[PDB]
Design a protein around this ligand. Structure first.
Ligand code: MN
Ligand code: MN
Ligand code: MN
Ligand code: MN
Length: 1341
């Protein structure tokens, strides 16, 4: 066989001239490794194997390190005619085989827009190429392979001896290493092939197998050789609509081997030796070099327009974690960074959440946080989208075989699957990442790709697709991170279901492979950590494993202390270990002869034959992690010792990662690296992290570079940073440390200076979140008053006020003459008012206040929800707003204050100053509300003036600000029957909250304040899917069922409806209105499946709210005096006959009104307010259900009972659930003996009900000739169009009566009137099926 030789200082490779093949590798020491010793010249194209002849291969030795081959690959029958150019290069102990050019003589290339390239070279391989091989005739001939396993009970590895009986053909592995005759080598390929896996719950590149092992006979022996799995070149793919595409290669085909001897000098030559060498040739995930620095992983969540975590709050929280960890690196995943929050706006990647502070605040957060070693990344979705998203198009939609939508999940809106192949082949996805790139430049660290591999985008989402997905992302300078534990083996540096050990159970975790973890532990957080509950891989892995907890809303996670406790429990040590590369791993108790690991490295001379891992860095430092015993029944199985350069730095049992049992582990870990590129720090910066689980006193040997010190400085780490400096003596290079249980300490060689932190940079105040300790109330905020101001809270610190106290601070960096919103979270337990006020040189620009807070916080992702115990096991925190214009003066100041000097507490947190164009609030001269309008077009956050109620308890509330994207968000697109937006770009949307029997959302006095005794006209535009599904609720104080007044609303589905009612301020000023979910079931109109959800039958949209004060009539001292006489006469003698709690509320109002009336020097305004309050008291004192019994009396036919209730004092225009007044309920039943008497008492004859009609329509429909004539006399609207369109003339002819038409037309009924349907007066009688009504219609009409 004509050959030639390639040379390096480490080896000489003999290569065949007739094909790109190796005969042998001969190391400097003479050890030889075989290649393909047999004449094998196979080239596979598009699945057809073609054997290449002598005339088909051209050879050129370029240099001593390189050869070029030109392969004439042809098959006329199978439409194959290509020219493959192969390069072979040698470098040190490595060999590379690259396909550098692929010329297709049957194609002019891919037509524009990734059209189908006919006879395209889709796949390429060299079957049984045997680039590297071992024979059964060689000393210790063995194979080690690795496949994907997300199951802690099932290893992904295999280890067996290569014996005469070894028979395999194209056996695929993610990794394969062969060893024998004192040399080991693994094969690397960039192949995107999907194959054999052990356990994986998803696709998304989990099944990437790039090595193919095959046996053949080499005379005497059986030879096992490794080849690369097939490569994809110009692959043809099909979208959900059947449209076919040809997409170019992700990269050209590449492969390599690295020949190793006894690399770890352990006297054995096995896969571990090849693995060490493999690192020099293997692909490395982009930005994997930074993984060891990411000590503090967490998610900062935003959801449902709430803006729970604006970008500049996230920066303050980075500073808090930096102080508590002494500056260890961080990785913050922004979940809901975009659009309205999490699972909103998918897949508009470039739409940075405007309510969070937009791209401007994101960049500030990223640039500034980077100074503290914090990395930032965003949660994106490439599988599901919502109609709101500007990317939503018919082409983007995934469709099924039937041609219908591939529906996603319904929550705030209905998600629709994205056609993944379209999104890739059209260039759509890559332009959306480009949109984000434009916003973030080079500031953002990573992308977090959710769900990829679950098969929502297509039934494929394979390694080829995943590779192209990771490329798009890496090309914009972003490190790849994803959801599923097994997902994206090639490019992911983090799996959420690997790092958050709680999800999915033991079958769905990180990578369970010794081979994979050996090779890449330092490059990823994608392994199995401690979660003993799962067993196997999760029972005290020696290398640790990232254990992720969160404190910023993700899944209601708000516990800061547990977050930090967990960092020091598992993640400091895990990260320390990641600064070293595994070089040896013996006695793995997971690997047995029974699970396919007979040949696994089992040394009885290291660690008593129990598990041990040795790791080293590029500087020759050695870490040794040892398991106390390989018996899971022994207490020692969970005992680990860690040594750094032969010195004990950690010992014990970690507290169980599943939170089941605390341990005893104590450590003194040398942290020698900066939190940036991880370069070594200087001696004055060299530090040790100390942790003692049980607490107590432990003695330790300091690292060698500390042996000559006489003392050390120890600081206890808090949210304030380095505290309680201790000087500890050093005797014989040893220290004694007393530590409290689960408490962090940092040890320095000398005195260390405090990390400089300037709280709330860019937030227009200093320390907006109250994280500066007790000290902020001295240094940043200014306290004045008799009362008490304290920074209370061991978790999320708040401001706690007691008595008369003013906490104030100057506003900075405001834009002169620009409109700003200033909101603060407030929880008021005091009856005395709690205020927010913006002033300029003594002038009050804006003020707002709250009495006792009347609504518990149900926002899951918010820091102070009712599950957070602010005081007495609850949280009533809700954002209180002020709107002002920044002064030209340039001198503005905020004041948080408490008015009454009672004992009760007021809680404030998160002072937010944000540019805002809202101007819908118009006041009176006295400062109270004249009117409020909201089109929801400028909401700083949330559904303001409404606040979310408890129909779903503490949840990621299915209520948010809906966005316009026509035609997709409008009624009529697909199965959609309701508009998301009624007016402008925004509305308040409720999704599927039917049959709750409780309040959905409501106004609160701190947003809308309804003055005791004052009348208001509440009006809004709305859309409700079904009749009686939602209701307007009218209450006083904290909501209690049976204490609220409901008005069930009519179906407005695709047509904006209108609602308006009169609200009278409750005697205690805690009156409000909102939306209530009734008990009646939706009218799904025969919808099946997701159609029930998307349709809108279960939904409620509200827009254009108008609240107007109705100016009352001016009263005299007299009118009011007389009203006290009247009110007391009716309810005095009835002393505790009804209630005792309601007697206190009655007596307190009579005192209030008397004060106003009798104040020496009172005025008409005092007299008319005392009278209006009294009128409202008389209404509260109608506790005996008279109003609900009067309506019950006109119904049944009780002509005698209406007489009793009316005179007694029941409401003249009392309404039921359908807005029927006593006139409506009696005009329809045919009771003239009830209507004649009710009309006399000034009962609203022109009052509109549920269907928008007056008792004219109800007296005409049921066939009452006596009630219609007496109604028109009393001033009934003959020309009255209802919400349904029908006037009293129309409905009179529909049932079957004529007589009414003549009595209506006489009074002035419009015959030319046309309803909403399109029917007129005469047109109705044609389809009636009778000419008995039509005859008198044609005579006059
Ligand atoms: Mn070795
Ligand atoms: Mn706070
Ligand atoms: Mn609007
Ligand atoms: Mn939405």
């Amino acid at each position: 066989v004509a050959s030639e030789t390639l040379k390096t200082k480490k080896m000489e490779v003999q290569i065949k001239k007739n094909f790109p093949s190796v005969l042998q590798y001969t190391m400097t020491d003479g050890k030889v490794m075989y290649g393909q010793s047999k004449d094998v010249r196979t080239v596979e194209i598009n699945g057809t194997n073609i054997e290449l002849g002598d005339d088909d291969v051209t050879f050129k030795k370029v240099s001593d390190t390189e050869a070029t081959y030109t392969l004439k690959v042809k098959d006329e029958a199978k439409k194959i005619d290509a020219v493959i150019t192969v390069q072979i290069t040698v470098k040190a102990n490595q060999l590379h085989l690259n396909v550098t050019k692929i010329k297709n003589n049957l194609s002019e290339g891919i037509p524009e827009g990734n059209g189908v390239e006919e006879n395209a070279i889709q796949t390429l391989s060299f079957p049984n190429q045997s680039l590297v091989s071992v024979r059964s005739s060689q000393e210790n001939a063995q194979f080690t392979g690795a496949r994907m396993s997300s199951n802690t009970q099932k290893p992904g590895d295999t280890n067996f001896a290569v014996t005469e009986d070894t028979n395999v053909t194209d056996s695929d592995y993610t990794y394969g290493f062969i060893s024998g005759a004192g040399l080991s080598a693994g094969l690397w390929s960039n192949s995107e092939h999907d194959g054999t896996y052990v356990a994986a719950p998803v696709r998304g590149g989990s099944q990437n197998t790039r090595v193919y092992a095959t046996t053949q006979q080499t005379g005497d022996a059986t030879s096992l050789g490794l080849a690369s799995a097939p490569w994809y070149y110009h692959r043809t793919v099909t979208d959900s609509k059947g449209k076919k595409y040809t997409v170019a290669e992700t990269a050209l085909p590449q492969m390599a081997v690295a020949i190793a001897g006894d690399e770890n000098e352990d006297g054995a030559v096995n896969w571990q030796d090849g693995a060490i060498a493999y690192r020099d040739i293997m692909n490395n995930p982009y930005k994997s070099e930074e993984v060891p620095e990411l000590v503090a992983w967490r998610i900062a969540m935003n959801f449902g327009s709430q803006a729970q975590n604006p970008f500049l709050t996230t920066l303050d929280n980075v500073k808090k974690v930096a102080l508590n960890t002494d500056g260890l690196g961080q990785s913050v995943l922004l979940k809901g960074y975009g659009n309205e929050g999490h699972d909103s706006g998918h897949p508009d990647y470039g739409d940075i959440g405007q309510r969070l502070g937009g791209a401007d605040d994101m960049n500030t957060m990223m640039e500034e946080g980077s100074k503290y070693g914090a990395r930032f990344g965003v949660h994106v979705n490439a599988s599901e989208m919502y109609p709101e998203a500007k990317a939503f198009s018919e082409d983007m939609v995934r469709r099924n075989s039937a041609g219908g939508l591939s529906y996603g999940w319904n929550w705030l809106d209905q998600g629709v699957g994205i056609d993944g192949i379209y999104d890739l082949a059209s260039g759509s996805r890559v332009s959306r990442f480009a949109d984000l790139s434009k916003e973030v430049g080079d500031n953002m660290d990573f992308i977090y790709l959710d769900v990829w591999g679950n098969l929502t985008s297509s039934g494929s989402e394979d390694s080829w697709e995943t590779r192209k997905m990771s490329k798009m992302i890496n090309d914009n300078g972003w490190r790849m991170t994803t959801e599923w534990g097994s997902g994206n083996e090639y490019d992911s540096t983090f799996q959420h279901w690997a790092a958050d050990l709680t999800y999915g159970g033991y079958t769905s975790k990180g990578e369970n492979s010794e081979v994979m973890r050996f090779l890449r532990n330092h490059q990823k957080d994608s392994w199995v950590g401690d979660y003993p509950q799962y067993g196997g891989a999760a029972n005290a892995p020696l290398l640790g494993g990232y254990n992720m907890k969160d404190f910023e809303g993700w899944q209601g996670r708000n516990d800061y202390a547990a977050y930090i406790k967990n960092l020091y429990t598992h993640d400091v040590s895990t990260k320390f270990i990641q600064h070293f590369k595994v070089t040896r791993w013996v006695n793995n108790p997971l690997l047995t002869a029974d699970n396919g690991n007979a040949a696994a490295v089992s040394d009885p001379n290291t660690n008593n034959g129990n598990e041990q891992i040795t790791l080293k860095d590029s500087n020759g430092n050695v870490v040794v992690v040892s398991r106390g015993s390989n018996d899971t029944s022994s207490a020692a199985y969970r005992q680990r010792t860690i040594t750094f350069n032969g010195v004990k730095v950690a010992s014990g049992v970690v507290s169980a990662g599943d939170g089941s049992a605390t341990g005893d582990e104590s450590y003194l870990l040398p942290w020698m690296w900066d939190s940036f590129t991880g370069k070594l720090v200087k001696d004055s910066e060299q530090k040790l992290y100390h942790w003692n689980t049980k607490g107590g006193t432990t003695t330790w040997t300091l690292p060698d570079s500390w042996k000559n010190l006489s003392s050390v400085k120890v600081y206890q780490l808090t949210d304030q940073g380095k505290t309680n400096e201790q000087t500890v003596a050093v005797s014989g290079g040893k220290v004694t440390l007393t530590a409290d249980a689960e408490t962090p300490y940092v040890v320095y060689k000398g005195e260390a200076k405090q990390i400089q932190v300037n709280w709330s940079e860019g937030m227009h105040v200093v320390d907006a979140g109250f994280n500066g300790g007790s000290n902020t109330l001295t240094d940043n905020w200014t306290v004045s008053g008799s009362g008490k101001a304290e920074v209370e809270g061991d978790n999320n610190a708040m401001l706690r006020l007691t008595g008369k106290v003013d906490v104030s601070q100057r506003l900075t960096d405001l834009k002169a003459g620009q409109k700003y919103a200033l909101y603060v979270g407030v929880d008021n337990r005091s009856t005395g008012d709690a205020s927010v006020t913006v002033t300029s040189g003594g002038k009050v620009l804006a003020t707002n206040s709250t009495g006792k807070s009347i609504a518990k916080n149900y926002i899951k992702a918010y820091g102070h929800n009712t599950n957070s115990n602010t005081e007495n096991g609850s949280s009533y925190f809700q954002n209180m707003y002020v709107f002002f214009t920044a002064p030209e003066n340039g001198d503005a100041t905020v004041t948080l204050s408490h008015k009454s000097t009672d004992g009760a507490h007021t809680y404030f947190d998160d002072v937010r100053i944000v540019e805002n164009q809202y101007s819908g609030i118009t006041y009176e001269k006295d400062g109270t509300l004249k009117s409020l309008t909201n089109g929801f077009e400028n909401n700083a956050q949330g559904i303001w003036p409404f606040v979310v109620s408890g129909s779903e308890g503490v949840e990621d509330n299915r209520i948010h600000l809906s966005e316009l994207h026509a035609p997709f968000t409008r009624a009529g697109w697909d199965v959609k029957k309701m508009d998301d937006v009624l007016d402008g770009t925004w509305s308040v949307k409720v999704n599927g909250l039917t049959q709750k029997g409780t309040l959905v959302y409501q106004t609160i006095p701190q947003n809308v304040k309804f003055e005791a005794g004052a009348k208001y006209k509440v009006s809004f535009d709305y859309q409700s899917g079904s009749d009686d599904i939602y209701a307007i609720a009218v209450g006083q104080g904290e909501y209690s069922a049976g204490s609220v007044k409901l008005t069930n609303l009519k179906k407005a589905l695709g047509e904006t409806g209108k609602a308006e009612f009169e609200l009278t301020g409750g005697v205690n000023g805690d009156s409000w209105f909102g939306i209530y979910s009734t008990a009646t079931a939706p009218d799904l109109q025969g919808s099946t499946g997701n159609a029930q959800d998307f349709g809108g039958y279960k939904d409620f949209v509200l827009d254009n709210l108008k609240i107007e004060r109705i100016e009352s009539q001016t009263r005299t001292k007299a009118e009011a005096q007389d009203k006290v006489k009247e009110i007391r006469g009716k309810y005095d003698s009835k002393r505790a006959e009804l209630s005792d709690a309601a007697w206190q509320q009655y007596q307190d109002t009579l005192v209030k009104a008397r004060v106003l009336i009798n104040k020496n020097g009172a005025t008409a305004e005092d007299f008319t307010k005392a009278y209006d309050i009294l009128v409202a008291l008389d209404e509260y004192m109608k506790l005996k259900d008279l109003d609900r019994k009067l309506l019950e009396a006109a119904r049944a036919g009780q002509d005698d009972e209406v007489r009793i209730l009316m005179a007694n004092g029941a409401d003249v225009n009392a309404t039921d659930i359908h807005g029927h007044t006593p006139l409506h309920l009696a005009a329809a039943m045919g009771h003239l003996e009830i209507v004649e008497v009710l009309l006399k008492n000034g009962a609203d004859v022109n009052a509109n009900d549920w269907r928008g009609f007056t008792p004219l329509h109800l007296a005409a429909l049921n066939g009452h000739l006596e009630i219609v004539e007496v109604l028109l006399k009393n001033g009934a609207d003959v020309n009255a169009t209802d919400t349904a369109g029908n006037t009293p003339l129309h409905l009179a002819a529909w049932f079957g009566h004529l007589e009414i038409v003549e009595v209506l037309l006489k009074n002035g009924a419009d015959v030319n009137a046309q309803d909403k349907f399109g029917k007129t007066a005469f047109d109705i009688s044609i389809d009636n099926g009778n000419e008995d009504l039509a005859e008198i219609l044609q005579k006059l009409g």
